[PDB]
Write an enzyme that holds these catalytic residues in place. Structure first.
Site, PDB file in Angstrom:
ATOM      1  CD  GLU A   1      -8.131  -6.243  12.115  1.00 25.81           C
ATOM      2  OE1 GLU A   1      -8.635  -7.306  12.470  1.00 25.81           O
ATOM      3  OE2 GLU A   1      -8.462  -5.504  11.360  1.00 25.81           O
TER       4      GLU A   1
ATOM      5  CG  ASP B   1     -14.221  -6.983  10.142  1.00 22.95           C
ATOM      6  OD1 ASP B   1     -14.853  -6.753   9.187  1.00 22.95           O
ATOM      7  OD2 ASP B   1     -14.037  -6.129  10.892  1.00 22.95           O
TER       8      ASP B   1
ATOM      9  CG  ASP C   1     -11.506   0.909   9.973  1.00 29.35           C
ATOM     10  OD1 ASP C   1     -11.454   1.937   9.111  1.00 29.35           O
ATOM     11  OD2 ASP C   1     -12.469  -0.005   9.966  1.00 29.35           O
TER      12      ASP C   1
ATOM     13  CG  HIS D   1     -15.321   3.827   9.847  1.00 29.60           C
ATOM     14  ND1 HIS D   1     -15.428   4.274   8.708  1.00 29.60           N
ATOM     15  CD2 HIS D   1     -14.514   2.538   9.498  1.00 29.60           C
ATOM     16  CE1 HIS D   1     -14.796   3.640   7.659  1.00 29.60           C
ATOM     17  NE2 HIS D   1     -14.255   2.577   8.248  1.00 29.60           N
TER      18      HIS D   1
ATOM     19  CB  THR E   1      -8.105  -7.443   9.061  1.00 28.84           C
ATOM     20  OG1 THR E   1      -8.423  -6.224   8.543  1.00 28.84           O
ATOM     21  CG2 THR E   1      -6.694  -7.483   9.325  1.00 28.84           C
TER      22      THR E   1
ATOM     23  CB  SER F   1     -10.483  -3.833   5.590  1.00 32.27           C
ATOM     24  OG  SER F   1     -11.224  -2.881   6.288  1.00 32.27           O
TER      25      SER F   1
ATOM     26  CG  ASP G   1      -6.862  -1.846   6.721  1.00 34.88           C
ATOM     27  OD1 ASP G   1      -6.356  -1.011   7.052  1.00 34.88           O
ATOM     28  OD2 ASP G   1      -7.853  -2.528   6.891  1.00 34.88           O
ATOM     29  CG  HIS G   2      -8.181   1.222   4.580  1.00 34.36           C
ATOM     30  ND1 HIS G   2      -8.823   0.108   4.582  1.00 34.36           N
ATOM     31  CD2 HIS G   2      -8.662   2.073   5.597  1.00 34.36           C
ATOM     32  CE1 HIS G   2      -9.766   0.234   5.760  1.00 34.36           C
ATOM     33  NE2 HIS G   2      -9.654   1.428   6.138  1.00 34.36           N
TER      34      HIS G   2
ATOM     35  CG  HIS H   1     -11.960   3.465   4.282  1.00 38.17           C
ATOM     36  ND1 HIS H   1     -12.530   2.329   3.743  1.00 38.17           N
ATOM     37  CD2 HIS H   1     -11.810   3.347   5.781  1.00 38.17           C
ATOM     38  CE1 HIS H   1     -12.721   1.597   4.967  1.00 38.17           C
ATOM     39  NE2 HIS H   1     -12.382   2.223   6.163  1.00 38.17           N
TER      40      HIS H   1
END
Ligand SMILES: [Mg+2]
Ligand SMILES: [Mg+2]
Ligand SMILES: [Zn+2]
Ligand SMILES: [Zn+2]
Lengths: 446, 446
Positions: free
Chosen positions: A319, A150, A324, A328, A152, A99, A366-367, A409
């Site tokens: 955000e 964080d 995410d 995870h 972002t 990120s 973002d991904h 990711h």
């Protein structure tokens, strides 16, 4: 400009034409969606790790397969964008970004290495879209459900060689060149206080407890420095709603949790052969999330309200971070619930934009992440779980790209959708860095 | 109408704005891409199992991360579409489709159960876009690199309750209601011979060796029946190039291989911890690829030539089948090579469309697959492999959603892109069934 009012299956899924989402030709609607006039405002909504798979899984569970997210799916212009990073030593592409690199790419327009914030592979700083917006005089907002330190949310206001440099202590040992006591610009939290966006809302109150090692506020906790610098500190919904104005004279800083704000939905963790050996799950609302903790939608709405009082225009980034995180953690319910959470915020944004008329709304990630939707009878090597959807059917989710601690990711290109002036710039194949140039050019910034 | 000439990183990936794929505002270009006029022709290119991940993997390897596929990536209008199937017993959604249900969805406009061809959950036949186009007088072509009996190409000309019903023998025991000797319409190969499209090119010569169990050509092989019914039989590139005309009087049937046509690239199979324990792979051209075997681009170009002689217009479906096959076989090089192969055919289609001016070119996939691009140091539970890209960097591919034999499909929504009149109908979120209606309406079919 028209917003996609309804793209749900029009009828009986089992009959001819019953699964259709279109009711007629779209040419005219698309023409009316195209405008090159200047954008007065920009609202960028990021679903952390929200690739197409995550969107589909969330839609299937919460709205049914033929369903339709009123926010996320309502944006008319869509495309796919690449988000690869760079290998610091070689400068060659690194196919799977984190990120930090991705956030830097869209926030500064330059590719970087995994873990960097607002610096290129040479460790040189580059101005963020927010700094630039603030320079031109626009109001600026930064909202997230994660710790404000964080990646972002940090990328907009900080320039550090490593994302881990949260506060003074961590920075001193991990980002010595950025350390305040070593003549650096400071830790992430410190640079955030310096950047002074008009509205900043999210979690991460923990790091503000640290004390400054050098500078004017040496010895004082970062929270004391915030107060002393004129920030309006808010720590709950009630206080947030009470704010009447937020500006450079009195910027808003909302710290609603020590770390990441609470997840919307609870559910068990995916387990090995979970779709086979365990029953189907039905997610349950998280009871510890509080009527006192604002939701992403409320934070978004308030932010839009305060930021809109600046006639010059505004830049707001929102955000949905825990999509995410939960992905995870191989926790379907948490992941899906945060996506639903983000959807509500996109709706808030779209409503304001639809009436204001000169606002560019962008929804993307973002991904890409690991979660996949697999056949119910699947025998996968990783973690899986069966869910009971709104369709009254079973859907199985699989997390099988990592053995270690956290599911990883992936490098797949992903969806980017937009609405408003200059949205045509997200159609077709583009790169994450084009987004910086699109926002900059749309705002007429220099 | 403009075709995306170049969307490659415009400069130095490491420098500000060097990764950009856009060189300016897109509003005007997008406006010029919108047209509602009637489409005279339609070319549908299907990349079997070619989701966004497969596209990115192939681009990274063959063109580099900042590269650009001249075909696949060149279509201006893009969107994402859902492809769920239905549970035959309940009629509820079944989130992960197979190729039969998905091909049935776009070819007939109705959702169905996994494994069905041209029939709904009640097993009722429904006319295909090809049958309808042939009825209205248009020329029709069906092209694939797979056995002609396989799902994708079969769906346009056959109606059977099970995709396994290739020829007489299999039909008699798996699709008794369709078996010719039981008063059914016949096997997949038999219905294919009845449908009589003007141009049919692909593999699967093997089943044509079976003999008819009943009917007028009882006792004769399906090959003999084809010859007796006036079909021009071609079995290699030379013979193919020799064909001057193809029409209802003398339809073209090209059987270029016993089963699936040979793969373009060879490479080892992905293995457990292959990125860790084995060295990086560089794909190599398949020596058995051939000079006597036409490539997908060649078949596409020849088909367009023959089909274009019908002034009424034409419908052509082209399928890069082995992308999915190799993806299942956890063979990165086969998978990627078939994606490069498809890209060349998309270029030929776009070239023709660009100059003809009334052609709708659509490129998409039937369903999403397993392959994921993961970090180089990934320790995955499934099969992985490291590849040496055109960037001179390493890319790792993971196949970890199934234990057994084959990697499975996934239910994530995926990219659909179009160029030409009526392309606006692929933008935003749509369903695979909407594609049937888009092609029908575009062609002015009733
Ligand atoms: Mg992320
Ligand atoms: Mg398929
Ligand atoms: Zn992540
Ligand atoms: Zn498949």
């Amino acid at each position: 400009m028209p917003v996609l009012e309804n793209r749900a299956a029009q009828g009986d899924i089992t009959a001819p034409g019953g699964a259709r989402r279109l009711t007629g030709d779209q040419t005219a609607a698309l023409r009316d969606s195209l405008s090159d006039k200047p954008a007065k405002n920009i609202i960028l909504l990021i679903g952390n790790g929200m690739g197409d798979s995550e969107i589909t899984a969330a839609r299937n569970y919460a709205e049914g397969a033929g369903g339709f997210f009123k926010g996320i799916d309502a944006l008319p212009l869509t495309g796919q964008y690449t988000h690869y990073a760079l290998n610091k030593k070689t400068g060659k592409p690194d196919y799977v970004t984190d990120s930090a690199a991705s956030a830097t790419a869209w926030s500064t327009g330059v590719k970087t290495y995994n873990g960097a914030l607002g610096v290129d592979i040479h460790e040189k700083d580059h101005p963020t879209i927010l700094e630039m917006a603030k320079a031109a005089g626009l109001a600026t907002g930064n909202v997230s459900t994660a710790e404000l330190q964080d990646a972002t949310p940090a990328a907009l206001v900080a320039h550090v060689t490593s994302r881990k440099c949260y506060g003074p202590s961590a920075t001193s040992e991990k980002c010595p060149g950025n350390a305040l006591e070593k003549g650096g610009k400071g830790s992430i939290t410190e640079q955030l206080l310096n950047a002074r966006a008009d509205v900043t809302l999210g979690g991460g109150a923990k790091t503000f407890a640290e004390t400054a090692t050098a500078g004017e506020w040496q010895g004082k906790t970062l929270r004391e420095q915030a107060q002393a610098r004129g920030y309006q500190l808010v720590s709950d919904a009630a206080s947030l709603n009470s704010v009447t104005e937020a500006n450079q004279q009195k910027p808003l800083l909302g710290l609603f949790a020590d770390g990441n704000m609470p997840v919307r939905w609870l559910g068990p963790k995916a387990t090995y052969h979970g779709n086979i050996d365990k029953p189907a799950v039905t997610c349950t609302p998280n009871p510890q999330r509080n009527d006192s903790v604002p939701t992403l939608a409320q934070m978004t709405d308030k932010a839009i309200e305060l930021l809109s009082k600046n006639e010059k225009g505004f830049f707001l980034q929102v955000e949905g971070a825990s999509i995410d995180k939960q992905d995870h953690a191989a926790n379907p319910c948490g992941q899906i619930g945060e996506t639903v959470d983000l959807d509500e915020a996109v709706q808030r944004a779209l409503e304001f934009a639809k009436k204001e008329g000169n606002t560019l709304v962008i929804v993307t990630a973002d991904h890409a992440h690991a979660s996949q939707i697999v056949a119910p009878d699947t025998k996968a090597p990783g973690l899986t779980q069966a869910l009971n959807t709104k369709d009254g059917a079973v859907m199985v989710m699989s997390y099988g790209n990592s053995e270690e601690d956290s599911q990883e990711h992936t490098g797949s290109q992903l969806r980017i959708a937009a609405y408003g002036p200059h949205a045509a710039n997200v159609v077709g194949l583009t790169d994450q860095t084009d987004l910086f140039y699109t926002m900059k050019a749309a705002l007429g910034l220099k």
